[PDB]
């Protein structure tokens, strides 16, 4: 259960843009700075940056 520390304003149709305070179900990540998360609201996927999130 990670948390968006920064407002990600993605501009592509792949990564989902989120805001601060929004929770994101992290999926796989432990090598680069880009991880894949899944929002528990609508049920979609969106690669969220690690600099805009952290374990909390």
């Amino acid at each position: 259960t990670f948390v968006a520390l920064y407002d990600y304003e993605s501009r592509t149709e792949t990564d989902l843009s989120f805001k601060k305070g929004e929770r994101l179900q992290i999926v796989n990540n432990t090598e680069g700075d880009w991880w894949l998360a899944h929002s528990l609201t609508t049920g979609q996927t969106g690669y969220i940056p690690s600099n805009y999130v952290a374990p909390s």
Partner: peptide, 9 residues
């Protein structure tokens, strides 16, 4: 994939 420029600050 240059990471997003953190909010200036």
């Amino acid at each position: 994939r240059a990471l997003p420029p953190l909010p200036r600050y």
